[PDB]
């Protein structure tokens, strides 16, 4: 549901994220637990407190997983089918939460790449995070 132009920036953005992917995923994850407390319950086995190590251990995973979706952005439902089964069947995450973590990613990316967060990119990124989300929440039964 994207576009040629969109994908360009999704990269242009990823680009200046590069090997910061983990620093960010954490902040997103943290901004999320902080701004939207209910999302915490999905992590009881978690010391969520600031600087939490496992929290960062997650941040890097999520980020990397996104780095994947950008590369295989044209075959998503497929290249991320292991995560859908995890998030839809096993974990059973409310689709509403993917909206929050996505907003928090746009915020995070926002406050760390002021030059790549151009209206047209923001729009793009938003669309991208939108799709990935529909994926990870699309195998419910």
């Amino acid at each position: 549901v994207l576009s040629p132009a969109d994908k360009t920036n999704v990269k242009a953005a990823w680009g200046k994220v590069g090997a910061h992917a983990g620093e960010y995923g954490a902040e997103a994850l943290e901004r999320m637990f902080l701004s939207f407390p209910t999302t915490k319950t999905y992590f009881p086995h978690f010391d969520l407190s600031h600087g939490s190590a496992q929290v960062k251990g997650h941040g890097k995973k999520v980020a990397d997983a996104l780095t994947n979706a950008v590369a295989h952005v044209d075959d998503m439902p497929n290249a991320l089918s292991a995560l859908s089964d995890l998030h839809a069947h096993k974990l059973r995450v409310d689709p509403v939460n993917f909206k929050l973590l996505s907003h928090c990613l746009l915020v995070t990316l926002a406050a760390h790449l002021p030059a790549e967060f151009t209206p047209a990119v923001h729009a793009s990124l938003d669309k991208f995070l939108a799709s990935v989300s529909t994926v990870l929440t699309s195998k419910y039964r």
Binding site: E27, V107, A111, F117, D126
Partner: protein, 146 residues
């Protein structure tokens, strides 16, 4: 609503440094670009066919200031957001027919704007506060739907 003196502090603090001439327009611009169906409520504004088009537009920058305005008024009456927005709610719901989900998206756009301007000075603890506010306005504005 109801934040905590810890929160009330970080917000009023941050709100101060906001350029009450750009931000309102910034948010309304990104709203229009990111969630384009919203342009529909703005034919009367003119050119809005491209990001630069929308963002450039002074009609948008103009309306943006009015919008920001209402937030400011609201931040000032966190204890009465419902009443504070009572007329704006009749306006937006009965009169204009905006769907409430959109109030929630403008609020999130605003928050992305504060992050873009204030970079890392915009911290999780602070955004959390703001998220309490924009949700508040969003809910306040939606009352003629309740």
């Amino acid at each position: 609503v109801h934040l905590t003196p810890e929160e009330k502090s970080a917000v009023t603090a941050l709100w101060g440094k906001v350029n009450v001439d750009e931000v309102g327009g910034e948010a309304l611009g990104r709203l229009l670009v990111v969630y384009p169906w919203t342009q529909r409520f703005f034919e009367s504004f003119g050119d809005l066919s491209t990001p630069d088009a929308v963002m450039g537009n002074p009609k948008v920058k103009a309306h943006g200031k009015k919008v920001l305005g209402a937030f400011s008024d609201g931040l000032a009456h966190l204890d009465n957001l419902k009443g504070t927005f009572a007329t704006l709610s009749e306006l937006h719901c009965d009169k204009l027919h905006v769907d409430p989900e959109n109030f929630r998206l403008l609020g999130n756009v605003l928050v992305c704007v504060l992050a873009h301007h204030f970079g890392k000075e915009f911290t999780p603890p602070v955004q959390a506060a703001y998220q309490k506010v924009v949700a508040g306005v969003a809910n306040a504005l939606a009352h003629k739907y309740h």
